[PDB]
Design a protein around this ligand. Structure first.
Ligand SMILES: [Mg+2]
Ligand SMILES: [Mg+2]
Ligand SMILES: [Mg+2]
Ligand SMILES: [Mg+2]
Ligand SMILES: [Mg+2]
Ligand SMILES: [Mg+2]
Ligand SMILES: [Mg+2]
Ligand SMILES: [Mg+2]
Ligand SMILES: [Mg+2]
Ligand SMILES: [Mg+2]
Ligand SMILES: [Mg+2]
Ligand SMILES: [Mg+2]
Ligand SMILES: [Mg+2]
Ligand SMILES: [Mg+2]
Ligand SMILES: [Mg+2]
Ligand SMILES: [Mg+2]
Ligand SMILES: [Mg+2]
Ligand SMILES: [Mg+2]
Ligand SMILES: [Mg+2]
Ligand SMILES: [Mg+2]
Ligand SMILES: [Mg+2]
Lengths: 77, 149
RNA sequence: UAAGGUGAUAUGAACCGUUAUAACCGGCGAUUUCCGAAUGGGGAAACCCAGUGUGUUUCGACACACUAUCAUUAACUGAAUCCAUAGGUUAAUGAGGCGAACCGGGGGAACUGAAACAUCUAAGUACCCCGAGGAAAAGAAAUCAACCGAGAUUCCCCCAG
RNA sequence: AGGGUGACAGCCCCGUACACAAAAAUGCACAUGCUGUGAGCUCGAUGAGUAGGGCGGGACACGUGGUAUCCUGUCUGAAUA
RNA sequence: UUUUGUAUAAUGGGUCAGCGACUUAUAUUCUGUAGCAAGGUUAACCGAAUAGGGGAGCCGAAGGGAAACCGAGUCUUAACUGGGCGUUAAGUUGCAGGGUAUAGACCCGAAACCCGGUGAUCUAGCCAUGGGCAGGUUGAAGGUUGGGUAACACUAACUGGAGGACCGAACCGACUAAUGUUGAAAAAUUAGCGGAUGACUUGUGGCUGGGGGUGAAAGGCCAAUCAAACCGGGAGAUAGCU
RNA sequence: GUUUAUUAAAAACACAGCACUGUGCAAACACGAAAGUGGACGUAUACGGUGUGACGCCUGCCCGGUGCCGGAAGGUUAAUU
RNA sequence: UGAGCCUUGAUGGAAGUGUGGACGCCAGUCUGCAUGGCUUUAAUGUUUGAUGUUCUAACGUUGACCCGUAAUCCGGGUUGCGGACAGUGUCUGGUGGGUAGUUUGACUGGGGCGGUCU
RNA sequence: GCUUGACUGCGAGCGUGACGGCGCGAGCAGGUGCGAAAGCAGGUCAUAGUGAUCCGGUGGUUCUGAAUGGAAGGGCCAUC
């Protein structure tokens, strides 16, 4: 449902606010692209519906430190 | 993105180098493929001495035998009787094997490729300026004296 | 608790009690058809059909009981590929649905007012959706003050239209 | 207090003040057994894709205004007493 | 009632009985009135509850200047003048009333706008599966045989049986007239009329839902409703009008 | 043949035919926040859109304006830095 | 190929003849390749943009096959094709009656037209 | 001819407006000019030649400036 899956980023709702200050609900949504990550240690290819930046996380922490959680909260993958 | 290397890799290969390459080239090839691992403490603050575990240690502590040059000195007149003949000469050939094997006395046994013969040893009888240079590092000074029966 | 009782329109009829469970009142239970989350499957709600068991058996019938899905865990099984997973079966747990308001969260109008109308207003209201408790939410300063100091949050009165 | 009773009753009736009563079942307090939690003391440790920042929005009484502060869809991204 | 003006042939009322429209909360200012007086008065809250306590605070006795600031003065100005606003006006708190503000704000009334649902048992398209079309007529293509040709063309009889083909019941439809118009009927009856093997007609069930559907297109149909359905809500929308 | 069920059956809609134009298929296009679906289990002799409306003889001149198609060298120009 | 950064380059073992390059204030020279006794423009390096090629390894696949599975879905696997393109998110220029909210004055010998408005 | 009174601060008192506002104004203070002087000049013989507020721009000012010193901003005066 368009969710970062790793950071839980969802599509927020805002206003278009065109010139003359005209309000018009628009709503923003995450990047997401679903990657083909290689757990390596788990010796498998786990594809997750990640998202820009949310991917930078997989790098900063770990494709395992990430999956450390996720499965922690009982998620897919 | 830094990460340590683990193989050839064109513009970067030190089987343990740290180069800042795009995170795309990584987590897509250099990594998940077997070619490099992120530079994360453990991969360093726990694997950084493995590198300095030689040039720094296995280079000056390695006394396994490098002290050979120093060990060989206390001798009792290292001489080899190549046997004289015909107005005084040599029946044998004191080249290399003999100079290095000049330790088979007390059953001891030293190297051999540690010869110091800038040229093909000649035939005489006097002392040989043979400097049994063990390791390509430390030198030495062994003597050889041809005689007869 | 008691001399009267078998709810009402409802008399009557057959009866039950006057000393101790006659009636009736309160606690705890028993039974509690079928529909309905409805859960064995199906379905035009209250109906149609099945599998596996089971006892008395005229030993067939009878009927009754278990069998939904998902989640966690445990055991056993187990593909593409040694492995290993995926998948499969079982069991034990728990959820499911309903409900007045109050409460937290997701989403969010317009009429209207501006004596017209776009910014602005109505209003984060109405409304939809999710979740929770007896309350919720909030909460022990990376708060505020002003060189003096105060010391979490919450609610009321002021400050001040 | 109040209600009923053949018209308006303190003393007809039911109640009323007051004083009493629980096999059991339970709300809430305490107090305790069980399971689980785990107290205290010495020395340590001190919340990074985070704080900030650019773009777009939103919340702040505060309509970007000279506009601090809070939140984040997007791109970034530190010090570390 | 409305009007310059109504017996007015201008509005409203058949009649009666009951109901039916300037309210309420808070705030602000006046008037009356009571308390106290350069003072008046408490708010929440405590409570031995209409007490008593609580004076946080609000209003008033000082004003002028944009302000710093000064002060019965103060601004203006270089001006110590003049000029403006002030200075020997009693205020304050209740209680009742007049007015105003925020509220539905005297009462009743739109056409409408927005939000969530209910409707394809009528109708419009389509989907699946079944049914129907008395009778009478015309007679295409193709074929056989004779003629004909070098062979084909071509020809004529017969055979054959086509068609949004012809006449006409059922069935479908709806051009005309009359009657009906408080109808027999919220569109029909009667006499005529058009199609009638087809883009035909009909039964059962299904699918499209409202700014949306469907439409051989009239804005037509979407349950006697349609230039945006019905139901409930925002809602006592708004009504400088009656 | 179709049409304003309930004042309009028509010269109106439709029609076979004609023309232009878009679409190389995961088609154009349409329903849908998306998944997906229709187009079509079709594939340019196909499908969509538009206008004209059997058939006969025909369908002239204008590309200035607007639209569409091609060019895109040069002028102007967003965020971004 | 821009632009940088800066290392090696010109004006601010020995003569004597050739053959390029730089323009020549031109007739002068500068500077390169045998035999003979800091400021201009580069070259490699290195960075970083602009194109444009090739690659695979993200990503696409509504090609083929295998397993879940005696499923057209979906997921995993293999292979082929494509490939950093496409596509999506955020930002941004164009287009945009497809849709939405509205505006579009009053006077007036009825209104409108005409005229008027200080 | 010579000049800058088309000056600065104020203003008794009036006129005219529902109001916002508009107009006339002797005289006072400071500095000007013209004249020998009295004196005249605060734009044109007069009456049309015009746009309130807000939001801002510019110059000036020690008015204010959110802990304090500055500063941004605000006020005041001139002006677009
Ligand atoms: Mg069921
Ligand atoms: Mg059942
Ligand atoms: Mg309005
Ligand atoms: Mg009249
Ligand atoms: Mg009358
Ligand atoms: Mg009456
Ligand atoms: Mg016919
Ligand atoms: Mg007929
Ligand atoms: Mg039907
Ligand atoms: Mg209708
Ligand atoms: Mg309302
Ligand atoms: Mg109303
Ligand atoms: Mg006809
Ligand atoms: Mg009609
Ligand atoms: Mg008709
Ligand atoms: Mg036509
Ligand atoms: Mg023509
Ligand atoms: Mg419009
Ligand atoms: Mg409106
Ligand atoms: Mg008018
Ligand atoms: Mg004049």
């Amino acid at each position: 449902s368009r969710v970062c899956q790793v950071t839980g980023k969802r599509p927020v709702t805002g206003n278009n606010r065109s010139h003359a200050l005209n309000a018009t609900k628009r709503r923003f949504l995450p990047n997401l692209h679903s990657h083909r990550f290689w757990v390596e240690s788990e010796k498998r290819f786990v594809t997750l519906r990640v998202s820009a930046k949310g991917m930078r996380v997989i790098d900063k922490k770990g494709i395992d430190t990430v999956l450390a959680e996720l499965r922690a909260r009982g998620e897919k993958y | 993105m830094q990460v340590i290397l683990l193989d050839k890799v064109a513009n970067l290969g030190s089987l343990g180098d740290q180069v800042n390459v795009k995170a795309g080239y990584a987590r897509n090839f250099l990594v998940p493929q077997g070619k490099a691992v992120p530079a994360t403490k453990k991969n360093i603050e726990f694997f950084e001495a493995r590198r300095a575990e030689l040039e720094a240690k296995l280079a000056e502590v390695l006394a396994a035998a490098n002290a050979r040059a120093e060990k060989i000195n206390a001798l009792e007149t290292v001489t080899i009787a190549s046997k004289a003949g015909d107005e005084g000469k040599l029946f044998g050939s004191i080249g290399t094997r003999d100079i290095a094997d000049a330790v088979t006395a007390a059953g001891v046994e030293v190297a051999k490729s540690e010869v110091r013969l800038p040229n093909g040893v000649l035939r005489t009888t006097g002392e040989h300026e043979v400097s049994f240079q063990v390791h390509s590092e430390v030198f030495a000074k062994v003597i050889v004296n041809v005689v007869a029966e």
